[model samples]
Each structure stands twice: as structure tokens, then as C-alpha cells.
Target: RSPLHEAAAQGRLLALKTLIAQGVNVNLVTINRVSSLHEACLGGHVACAKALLENGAHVNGVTVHGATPLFNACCSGSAACVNVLLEFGAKAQLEVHLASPIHEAVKRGHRECMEILLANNVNIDHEVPQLGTPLYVACTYQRVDCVKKLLELGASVDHGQWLDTPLHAAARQSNVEVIHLLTDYGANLKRRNAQGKSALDLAAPKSSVEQALLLREGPPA
Candidate 1:
């Protein structure tokens, strides 16, 4: 890796500044197509990222994996980097290979990054192949805070991966708190997935508490 890439990845602000002053290409990419801006944003180094952006780094540059700096910043939970990238006109769209930025932030429990993406007008309910929407992913991963953020931001509780609703996913994982949150948001108690299994049926064995909660509530009105 180049010194600029290393400094940016390691969050060494002074070294990064020195490398930049020495006229190293700010947008230089490794064989993997990773750039200094990608490193700085991934490491959540606000000042280093600011320096890179000021020095004309490609804000939307992607790696071989098609991971954009904005995507990396979201995955790293760097709200500051996200803010800068959005301000510099980074594409809000998710890479084809990776999950949506909002989904990634939610899965990683990065509420601040979530806020930045949401404020940028990214769809909160954007689906991720088999994983579902931000809410479903959050529930599947048991990220309560992310679930709350998506719900509060008006995510459709019943959207995406309809067969395997967020409630079913949460129940399967035995995430009681998430179950409660979903129910409170008016999740369909009687909803069934593709396997003809309701949240109650899905909760058997692994999550007794969640199963009991479902049983006690009967079915949705």
C-alpha cells in the first residue's frame, strides 16, 4: 500500500497531510482499486477525509468490490465522512454487490450513519436480496437501536421479504426486545411466511419467551 493509503487508513492526519503536500496523487488506487479516500472514510478519520476531499479525492470512487467511499463510511459508522461525501455529491445508491448503505448501517447498529443516509433521502426500506429491508435486517441481526431508527423514520413494518417478516426473523433469533418493538409498531401477529409458518410457529424451541408472547396475544385484529 502507498504511504498516502496507509496514512489515510491508519488515520494519521499529519502523515496524510505531508503526503498530500508532497503531491502524491490523492485519487491513487491500489491494485484492488481502493483509494485513499476509501481508506480514510472506512477508518472514520474525519480530518483525514476532509483533507482528502479538499485535495480533490474522488468522493464516489469504488473498489473492485464496487464499494464506494460513502458505503465504506456507512459500514464504518462514520457520520462525518458520510456527511462530507453526500455534500460532495456522492451517489446515494447502494453498490450492486453489497447491501444498501442504510441496511449496512442498520445491521451494524450505526444510528448516526443511518441518520445521515436517511437525511440524504435514501430509501429506508430498500431491500437486500434475500436479507430483506433495513428493518428486517436489523431484526434479523438483533440490532434494536437500528430497528427503532428505521421504524421511527417510517419504515414499512410489513414490507420486504413478506414471507419472512421482521417479526418472524426476530422470533427465530429469540430477540425478545425486537419482537416487542415490532409488535408495538403493529406487526401482524397472524402473518405467515413462505413455509406456512407464522411468527409463533417460527419461535418454537429457540425462543420460548417470544413464543409465549405471541401465544398470549392471540392473532392480529
Candidate 2:
């Protein structure tokens, strides 16, 4: 780790100040390929992050793996860090790492972070290469709170593609609560996925949760 990286990692504000005063690059990337800003965000050290930002660390700096500081914070499930980056002008809709902020937060069931992202206008229908919308990802992954948050934040309860609405995705995953939430938000039950399977047809996966969802929807023809 560089001096700035180590200081940011440990939230050592004094050490960070001394390093910066000695002309160390505040935006230096560490040997592990993480930048000082990335380390601060990952460590949830808002103070250090602010210090680096004050010293001109790029708020939207991209890593070799495509992870920005915001992406690092979201993957760490650190709502505080996410908020800090947002305050520093980070784009909520950006996909930096393997997961976008919405995808990562939903996958981890980070309800608070998901709420913040949605509220801040992260695209509810953002479909990455592997993951779909925030709602679809939340449903497919069985993240109830994330699903609820997306719905409340104006996700298209009935707006999905290729695989049907988020309701179908939830049913495919056999999540009863997700089904109920989507239904309450006007999800269409007659939807299907790429396999031509209706939500109920997709629920026949043989898992307990899957069975529960199938039962909730009654027997499929």
C-alpha cells in the first residue's frame, strides 16, 4: 500500500495529511490495484475519502476491474460510504464493477443503500449484461426489502423483458413474499420467461420456496 492508501485504509487523517504535504499523489493506485479513494470507500472511512476528495481524488475513478469508489462502497454494503460518494457527485447509475450499485445492493439485500440509490434516480430498469433491472435482480435473488424499495421508488412492477416482469422472475426463484409484493404493485401473473413458462410454470422447480410460490399461485395447467 502507498502511504496515502495505508492512511486512507486506516482512516489515519494525520498520516494522510503528512503524506499529502510531502507531495504524495493523493489519487495514487495501490500495489493491489486499488486507488487511495477506493480503499477509503471500501474501508468506510468517510473522513479519509473526503480528505482525498479535497486533494482532487477522482470521485468517479475506474479501476482495472472496472470498480469505481462508489462500486467498492456498494459491494461493501456500506450505506454511509455510498452516501458520501453520492454527496461528492458520483453517478448512482454507473456500473463500475461486476455489479452496478443497484445490482450489488439488491444482491446483498442492502435495503438502505437500495433505497438511497432508487431515491437518487438510479435507473430501476437498468439491465447489465448478466443482471437485469434493480427490481428483477432483487426478485431473482429473493431480496424482499430490495424488491419493496425498488417498487416504492417507481420500478415498473409490470415492466420486464425477455423473461417477463419482475413478478415472473420472483416466481421463478420461488419467493412468495416477492410475488406478493409484485402483485400488490400490479404485476401481471400471466407473464412468462424465455422458456414460455408462466410465473406459476416457472415455480415448479421442486425447492420448498418454489413449491410455496407454486401453491400460492395454485396448480398450473
Each model's C-alpha lDDT? 0.82, 0.77
Q: Which regions of candidate 2 fall more than 4 Å away from where they truly are?
A: 30-33, 95-99, 204-221
Q: In model 1, which runs have C-alpha deviations exceeding 4 angstroms?
A: 95-99, 206-208, 219-221
TM-score of each: 0.92, 0.83
Across 70-139, the per-residue lDDT of candidate 1 in tens digits comes to 8889878988888888888888866558536777777788988887788878878777778788888888
lDDT by residue for model 2 (1-221), tens: 67788888887988888888899888777555688999888877887888888888898988777788887887778888888889989988874344477788788787888878877987777777556677887888898878887788778887665466777777667567787788778777776677787776766557765665554553557
Residue pairs in clash, model 1: none
Model 1 per-residue lDDT at 115: 78
